[PDB]
Amino acid sequence: SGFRKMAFPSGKVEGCMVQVTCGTTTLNGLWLDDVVYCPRHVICTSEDMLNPNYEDLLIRKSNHNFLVQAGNVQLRVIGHSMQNCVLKLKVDTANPKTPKYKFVRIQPGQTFSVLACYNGSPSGVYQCAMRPNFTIKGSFLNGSCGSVGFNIDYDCVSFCYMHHMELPTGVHAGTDLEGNFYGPFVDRQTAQAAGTDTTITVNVLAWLYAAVINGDRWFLNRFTTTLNDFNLVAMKYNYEPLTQDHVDILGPLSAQTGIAVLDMCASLKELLQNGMNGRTILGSALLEDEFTPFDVVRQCSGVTF
Amino acid sequence: SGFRKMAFPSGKVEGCMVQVTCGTTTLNGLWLDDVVYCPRHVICTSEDMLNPNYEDLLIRKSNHNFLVQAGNVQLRVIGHSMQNCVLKLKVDTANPKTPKYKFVRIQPGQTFSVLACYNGSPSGVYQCAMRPNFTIKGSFLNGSCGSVGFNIDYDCVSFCYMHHMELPTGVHAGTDLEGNFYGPFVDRQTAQAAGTDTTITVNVLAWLYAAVINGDRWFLNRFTTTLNDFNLVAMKYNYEPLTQDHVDILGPLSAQTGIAVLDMCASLKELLQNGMNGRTILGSALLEDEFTPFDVVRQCSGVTF
Ligand SMILES: C[C@@H](O)Cn1c(=O)n(C[C@H]2CO2)c(=O)n(C[C@@H]2CO2)c1=O
Numbered sequence: 001s002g003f004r005k006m007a008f009p010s011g012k013v014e015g016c017m018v019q020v021t022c023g024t025t026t027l028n029g030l031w032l033d034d035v036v037y038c039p040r041h042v043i044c045t046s047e048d049m050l051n052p053n054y055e056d057l058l059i060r061k062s063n064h065n066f067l068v069q070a071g072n073v074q075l076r077v078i079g080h081s082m083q084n085c086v087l088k089l090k091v092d093t094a095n096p097k098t099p100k101y102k103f104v105r106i107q108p109g110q111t112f113s114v115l116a117c118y119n120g121s122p123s124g125v126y127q128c129a130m131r132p133n134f135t136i137k138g139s140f141l142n143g144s145c146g147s148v149g150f151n152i153d154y155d156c157v158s159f160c161y162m163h164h165m166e167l168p169t170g171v172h173a174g175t176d177l178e179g180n181f182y183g184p185f186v187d188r189q190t191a192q193a194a195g196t197d198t199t200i201t202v203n204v205l206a207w208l209y210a211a212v213i214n215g216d217r218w219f220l221n222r223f224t225t226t227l228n229d230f231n232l233v234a235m236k237y238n239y240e241p242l243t244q245d246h247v248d249i250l251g252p253l254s255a256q257t258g259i260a261v262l263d264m265c266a267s268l269k270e271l272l273q274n275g276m277n278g279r280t281i282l283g284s285a286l287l288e289d290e291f292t293p294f295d296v297v298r299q300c301s302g303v304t305f
Numbered sequence: 306s307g308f309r310k311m312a313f314p315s316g317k318v319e320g321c322m323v324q325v326t327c328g329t330t331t332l333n334g335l336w337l338d339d340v341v342y343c344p345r346h347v348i349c350t351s352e353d354m355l356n357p358n359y360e361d362l363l364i365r366k367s368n369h370n371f372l373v374q375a376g377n378v379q380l381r382v383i384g385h386s387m388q389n390c391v392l393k394l395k396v397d398t399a400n401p402k403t404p405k406y407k408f409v410r411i412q413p414g415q416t417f418s419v420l421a422c423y424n425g426s427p428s429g430v431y432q433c434a435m436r437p438n439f440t441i442k443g444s445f446l447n448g449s450c451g452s453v454g455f456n457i458d459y460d461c462v463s464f465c466y467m468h469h470m471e472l473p474t475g476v477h478a479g480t481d482l483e484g485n486f487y488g489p490f491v492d493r494q495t496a497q498a499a500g501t502d503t504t505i506t507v508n509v510l511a512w513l514y515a516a517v518i519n520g521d522r523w524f525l526n527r528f529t530t531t532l533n534d535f536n537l538v539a540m541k542y543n544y545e546p547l548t549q550d551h552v553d554i555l556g557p558l559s560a561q562t563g564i565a566v567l568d569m570c571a572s573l574k575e576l577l578q579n580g581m582n583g584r585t586i587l588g589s590a591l592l593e594d595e596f597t598p599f600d601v602v603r604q605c606s607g608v609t610f
């Protein structure tokens with residue numbers, strides 16, 4: 001029993017993390033097969049971060065400029081190119097620890113595990129979610145750039161995030177493994193602000209189901225509601241509009257508890273209109289929205305890898 | 306920036322997790338060098354969980370009764386003994402992946418990382434704390450027994466917890482790696498209840514310091530206080546008594562923020578007497594007490610391994 005924020009076992013990704021140095025700057029890189037993946041802003045100098053022309057800054061760079069340190073050993077660089085906002089450094093040695101991997105662009109509301117690193121060495125691991133505004137609330141200090149997010153299913157690692165920057169608001173923005181930024185963010189030190197951070201409604205319901213399973217049933221009520229009428233309360237509280245697909249995704253949880261999705265939507269509406277009144281649900285005094293329906297099933301059924 | 310609940314990289318421990326089968330029961334075991342460590346209640350049958358005599362149940366067990374599966378391979382068992390509440394199965398093959406390890410009995414209030422497993426295979430990782438009542442609030446399903454807790458410093462893994470059971474109250478109890486239970490708990494299906502779960506005061510202050518660093522300063526006030534007078538508010542709210550050693554441990558955080566420990570104790574007292582009034586600190590609506598002073602420094606300075 002018990003429900004916790006759980007990251008995946010990070011072993012398979014540790015062995016893909018390297019140190020990448022270009023000139024005076026060091027950041028983390030991911031090393032699968034004979035390619036090292038890192039953010040392209042490794043090549044920006046002290047005064048270039050405001051408005052760099054990355055194509056031009058590349059002309060003045062050759063293979064031997066990028067120094068890649070694996071653990072304590074050196075990797076020989078034999079090719080490089082710029083794909084969107086990441087660099088792809090072809091090294092001469094395939095990584096012996098390359099797990100079965102895939103590059104996936106995840107959707108807002110989905111969650112992943114982040115292995116925070118500095119100088120190509122791991123520091124820790126935490127579970128994050130792609131906010132509706134395409135930012136993540138994580139823990140990154142200077143030099144964590146290149147840290148990656150991923151999901152582990154069976155024996156296959158699906159890489160979905162590479163960290164690029166912190167915004168003036170203290171939140172984080174990054175790209176997928178093809179170099180495309182999540183959201184309208186660019187790798188420049190310009191004025192860019194995240195939009196309204198709405199709540200992942202389908203994820204709050206999944207967490208309420210997880211609570212029922214774990215013995216917390218005080219928030220269950222004698223009301224029900226309809227989708228259209230529930231969405232009208234969600235909009236007032238900046239909650240993501242709940243669709244029928246979301247309802248279908250909650251089926252397995254709805255069947256395991258004998259609680260209709262709409263009856264659970266009615267209890268949520270009460271929480272939004274009346275607050276928690278100093279009560280706690282799964283040890284928390286606010287509504288948690290960083291658990292997907294699959295996240296709950298995974299932890300409440302004990303899926304392994 | 307950003308402050309998160311962070312587990313250590315779990316790679317070095319994954320390669321020590323095995324499956325242990327004894328008769329009809331399967332649970333997880335830890336495999337360092339040529340010894341496999343598992344809970345001794347692997348040998349209890351369906352009707353034995355109420356009042357087992359583990360010495361007697363051992364007489365009827367020999368080496369070939371314990372089947373140890375490493376990944377998908379079989380380990381040959383050549384010796385076994387019972388130390389407190391864990392078994393020590395001597396196998397004939399040293400583990401090639403044995404990290405630099407140590408067995409440590411941690412103190413109430415300290416934190417560690419837990420790698421949850423089922424059938425000797427990892428499922429995930431989360432950060433826990435040893436409550437003052439010697440229980441932990443974690444996520445364990447049937448078969449997670451044998452999952453271990455640990456800290457990683459430099460390249461050395463300090464194992465401190467092996468999970469044994471869930472209590473009728475939904476919390477968790479276990480042992481150190483010498484088999485001694487944390488708290489007054491036994492590996493029996495008897496009536497055992499955890500005591501008062503008081504709050505780790507030194508850990509709440511460390512988390513308040515982490516908040517100041519990350520931009521949340523609304524809880525800082527114009528008051529101060531004394532230790533004796535603050536403890537009198539702590540006792541009313543079932544908070545662990547704050548000693549001078551605790552104050553000394555908070556020095557480094559106190560110096561990095563230019564905030565005396567006692568001035569921070571005064572802000573906490575206000576939170577306890579007046580509540581948070583619907584405000585959030587580091588994204589949470591209650592006072593978090595599962596971050597040690599070293600946990601905060603680690604994450605706010607970027608320590609790696
Ligand atoms: C990659 C992470 O480690 C965070 N980070 C970062 O996003 N930028 C992008 C731009 C906003 O400054 C950056 O330039 N640096 C270097 C130091 C802070 O100026 C930096 O550390």
Ligand SMILES: C[C@@H](O)Cn1c(=O)n(C[C@H]2CO2)c(=O)n(C[C@@H]2CO2)c1=O
Nearest residue numbers: 354446447448449450469470471493494
């Ligand atoms: C080891 C973990 O997986 C949890 N767990 C457990 O603590 N006990 C000890 C005693 C209270 O029942 C136990 O017997 N089992 C087997 C199934 C539940 O009866 C069990 O799964």
